[PDB]
Amino acid sequence: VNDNEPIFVSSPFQATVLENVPLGYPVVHIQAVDADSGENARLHYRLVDTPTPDFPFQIHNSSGWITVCAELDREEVEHYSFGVEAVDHGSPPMSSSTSVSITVLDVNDNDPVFTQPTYELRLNEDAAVGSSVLTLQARDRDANSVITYQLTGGNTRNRFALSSQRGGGLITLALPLDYKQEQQYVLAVTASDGTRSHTAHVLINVTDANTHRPVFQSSHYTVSVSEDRPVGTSIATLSANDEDTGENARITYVIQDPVPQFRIDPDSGTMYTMMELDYENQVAYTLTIMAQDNGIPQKSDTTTLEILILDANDNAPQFLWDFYQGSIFEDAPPSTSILQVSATDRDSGPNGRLLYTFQGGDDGDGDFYIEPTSGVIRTQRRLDRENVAVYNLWALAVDRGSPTPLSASVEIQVTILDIN
Ligand SMILES: [Ca+2]
Ligand SMILES: [Ca+2]
Ligand SMILES: [Ca+2]
Ligand SMILES: [Ca+2]
Ligand SMILES: [Ca+2]
Ligand SMILES: [Ca+2]
Ligand SMILES: [Ca+2]
Ligand SMILES: [Ca+2]
Ligand SMILES: [Cl-]
Ligand SMILES: [Mg+2]
Ligand code: NA
């Protein structure tokens, strides 16, 4: 006579299991006590449905042990809710049912995964230090995985910085860019859960910017030019150098205060004369000159050029009087002055400095001489009106001009006065 319903040992059943356990792992012993003996007391166990995408457990129909019969995965199903039923082999058979809960415990069996498969961007070379470059996010399907981000290769000259945070991993500019040193970076970034990792690559191209001004070779050029030089003489080649690239570094030269006498070639920075120059009119010119790059926006420098005109022997001496006349008594001793000639020369230096001489002239067959620097004409000999009563002397003023010296001549008449 079958008088007792099978009673379970725990009120409902509950168990946890690492997602790791092998096929065969004993999860829970379901136990029931029938209060009879014989077959009135003999129990069979069965799992009942009370939807999960898998059901990786089974119960042994006599022992009551639930074992894993397919590999578990917490990232597929954390929690399984189902039932178990115990039944006696009684001719009127009795049974009871309870619930079973199995919670699956997390193991670190997933790598962190970047949210983008690929990372690419373009930075302007003048991007500010501190500015944001990129935020990278990875995710880990494990519940118990904290993600730390780290810059782990290709940070050349330590240009970039990476703050690791809750959301993800922020890249900033730590130190200034320079197109002349690096056009490109390939930053490795690794996402780690503390044991597993993945490494993303960030391709960064740098666009040259106009971060430099031309710098002239000098802030004050001085060059010299003979007043001789024809129209179209090159007199100097100014240059500025710009550390940028392309148009940002290509120089246009510009006279800021133009004069008719000079022009510049804007591409080559060469200065040419545009007119005849005259030392006797202006000895010096000063120009202010710009070098502008061709960047957007444009930058520029400034220098002064001082142009010194060099004097040329382009002026001939000129006597103050076109004719001189003087007298002396016949009985006068040697070294008696008759008179002093003078000349001027509009040139300076040796070009303007004067020698008075009878050479190329006439000194009355040696009867007179002239002092080279003073121009004073003197008797050299005793005189005789029997012989010469009236000399027609010819004096020369010669400059000391190098390339070829210039001169002028003047007539001096010398009357020899009688003795009563
Ligand atoms: Ca029973
Ligand atoms: Ca798993
Ligand atoms: Ca993980
Ligand atoms: Ca896991
Ligand atoms: Ca520039
Ligand atoms: Ca002149
Ligand atoms: Ca001159
Ligand atoms: Ca002269
Ligand atoms: Cl006179
Ligand atoms: Mg699976
Ligand atoms: Na630049």
Dihedral sign for Cα 49, 55, 57, 60, please.
positive
Residues with CB under 5 A from ligand 7 (ion): 279, 311-312, 314, 347
What Rg, from alpha-carbon coordinates, does the chain have? 58
Dist. CA 53 → ligand 4 center (Å)? 17
3-class state of residue 97 by DSSP: strand
Residue 280's alpha-carbon distances to 148, 287, 346, in angstroms, are: 83, 20, 7
DSSP states along 202-268: EEEEEE-------EES-SEEEEEEETTPPTT-EEEE--EE-SS-GGGT--EEEESS-BTTEEE-TTT
- Cα-flanking dihedrals φ and ψ of residue 226, to 5°? -65, 135
Residue 366 is which amino acid? G
Identify which of 36, 128, 48 has the alpha carbon closest to the alpha carbon of residue 85: 48
DSSP states along 142-165: STT---EEEEEE--GGG-EEEEE-
- Cα-flanking dihedrals φ and ψ of residue 264, to 5°? -115, 150
- Where b means 16+ CB within 10 Å and e means fewer, 305-332 reads bebebebbbbbbbebeeeebeeebebeb
Residue 273 is which amino acid? T
Record the tokens describing residue 40, joined without a space: 């009135």
Strand partners, 136: 169
Q: What's the rounded Cα separation, in Å, for the pair 32 and 26?
A: 17
Residue 224 is which amino acid? S
Dihedral sign for Cα 98, 99, 104, 105, please.
negative
- Residues sharing a CB contact under 8 Å with residue 387, sequence separation 6 or more, in sequence order: none
Dist. CA 113 → ligand 2 center (Å)? 15
Dist. CA 287 → ligand 5 center (Å)? 23
Place of tokens 């009127």: 92
Residue 142's alpha-carbon distances to 116, 139, 148, 199, in angstroms, are: 19, 9, 14, 18
Domains and CATH numbers, the chain: 7-105 (2.60.40.60), 113-207 (2.60.40.60), 215-310 (2.60.40.60), 318-417 (2.60.40.60)
Q: ω before 297 within 30° of 0 (cis)?
A: yes
Ligand nearest to the Cα of 54, by number: 10
In the chain, what's the furthest Cα-to-Cα distance?
202
Dist. CA 278 → ligand 7 center (Å)? 7
Q: What's the rounded Cα separation, in Å, for the pair 139 and 40?
A: 56
DSSP states along 333-357: PTT-EEEE--EE-SS-GGGT-EEEE
Identify which of 315, 301, 173 has the alpha carbon closest to the alpha carbon of residue 242: 301
In this structure, the number of other CB atoms found within 10 A of the CB of residue 337 comes to 14
Record the tokens describing residue 45, joined without a space: 């166990």
For the sheet containing 324-329, what is the strand order?
324-329, 407-417, 390-399, 354-362
Q: What's the rounded Cα separation, in Å, for the pair 320 and 65?
A: 143
Query: What does the chain come to in residues?
Result: 420
Identify which of 72, 139, 125 has the alpha carbon closest to the alpha carbon of residue 102: 72
Q: What's the rounded Cα separation, in Å, for the pair 99 and 96?
A: 11
Q: What's the rounded Cα separation, in Å, for the pair 174 and 270?
A: 43
- Parallel, antiparallel, or unpaired for β 197-207 and 184-192? antiparallel
Measured torsion, CA atoms of residues 193, 198, 200, 201, in degrees rounded to the nearest 10: 130
Q: What's the rounded Cα separation, in Å, for the pair 58 and 60?
A: 7
Angle among Cα 165, 166, 167 to the nearest 5 degrees reads 95
Place of tokens 């444009």: 298
Identify which of 20, 27, 23 has the alpha carbon closest to the alpha carbon of residue 106: 20
Record the tokens describing residue 302, joined without a space: 């400034």
Dist. CA 93 → ligand 1 center (Å)? 7
Residues with CB under 5 A from ligand 3 (ion): 108, 110, 140, 142, 145, 193
For the chain, the distance separating the N- and C-terminal CA atoms, rounded to the nearest angstrom, is 202
Dist. CA 106 → ligand 3 center (Å)? 10
Checking phi first, is residue 374 left (phi over 0); if not, alpha (psi -120 to 50) or beta?
Answer: alpha
Place of tokens 């100014």: 238
Q: What's the rounded Cα separation, in Å, for the pair 348 and 368?
A: 30
Dist. CA 31 → ligand 10 center (Å)? 29
Q: What's the rounded Cα separation, in Å, for the pair 314 and 139?
A: 91
Experimentally, how was this structure solved?
X-ray
Strand partners, 203: 120, 186
Ligand nearest to the Cα of 111, by number: 3
Residue 138's alpha-carbon distances to 97, 141, 174, 297, 367, in angstroms, are: 45, 10, 23, 40, 118
Ligand nearest to the Cα of 338, by number: 9
Place of tokens 């995965």: 73
Contact 177, 208 (CB under 8 A): no
Checking phi first, is residue 404 left (phi over 0); if not, alpha (psi -120 to 50) or beta?
Answer: beta
Q: What's the rounded Cα separation, in Å, for the pair 397 and 355?
A: 6
In this structure, the number of other CB atoms found within 10 A of the CB of residue 200 comes to 21
Contact 60, 49 (CB under 8 A): no
Q: What's the rounded Cα separation, in Å, for the pair 220 and 254?
A: 16
Contact 417, 391 (CB under 8 A): no
Q: What's the rounded Cα separation, in Å, for the pair 305 and 12?
A: 102
- Residues sharing a CB contact under 8 Å with residue 44, sequence separation 6 or more, in sequence order: 61, 62, 86, 87, 89
Identify which of 29, 28, 8, 24 has the alpha carbon closest to the alpha carbon of residue 16: 28
Instruction: For the chain, give the residues followed by a break (C–N over 2.5 Å).
Output: 50
In this structure, the number of other CB atoms found within 10 A of the CB of residue 83 comes to 15
- Cα-flanking dihedrals φ and ψ of residue 101, to 5°? -120, 130
Strand partners, 264: 271
Angle among Cα 186, 191, 193 to the nearest 5 degrees reads 165
Dist. CA 207 → ligand 11 center (Å)? 8
Record the tokens describing residue 300, joined without a space: 């520029």
Dist. CA 372 → ligand 3 center (Å)? 110
Header resolution in angstroms? 2.3
